[PDB]
């Protein structure tokens, strides 16, 4: 099992983040598992962002529906999170993980950190 996380280093205050994460090796013949995205900034604790099942269903955190979109490849290669209208409090590190329901986040990726250029 390998999880690869890719994202920009510095972004503009008016730009949109395009994070990508790739997973290698899973039992895709299952129900309830999926791919989740979580983030945290330094100085404040963890908070969850999103999770996708294998049926194409997208679950984001509430009151953040419009500025969160997910590209799912349907080829078992990579999952893309595109988030628009970023805020300088969201300058943070991002972890892509596997998500069952007992194991809330079973295996964790390395993740990438991003900061604003303003």
């Amino acid at each position: 099992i390998t999880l690869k996380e890719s994202g920009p280093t510095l972004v503009k205050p008016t730009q949109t983040l395009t994070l990508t994460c790739a997973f290698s090796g899973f039992s895709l013949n299952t129900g309830g598992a999926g791919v989740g995205w979580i983030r945290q900034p330094p100085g404040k604790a963890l908070e969850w962002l999103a999770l996708i099942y294998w049926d194409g269903d997208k679950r984001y955190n509430p009151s953040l529906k419009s500025r969160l979109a997910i590209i799912m490849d349907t080829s078992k290669n990579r999952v893309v999170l595109t988030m628009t209208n970023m805020d300088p409090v969201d300058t943070a590190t991002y972890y892509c993980a596997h998500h069952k329901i007992e194991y809330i986040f079973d295996y964790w990726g390395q993740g990438t950190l991003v900061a604003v250029s303003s």
Partner: peptide
Amino acid sequence: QYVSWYQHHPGKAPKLLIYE
């Protein structure tokens, strides 16, 4: 039900320790 315990390291990926 289904509360889990994890451990985080500075500069390293977090890992699962206890499930349910």
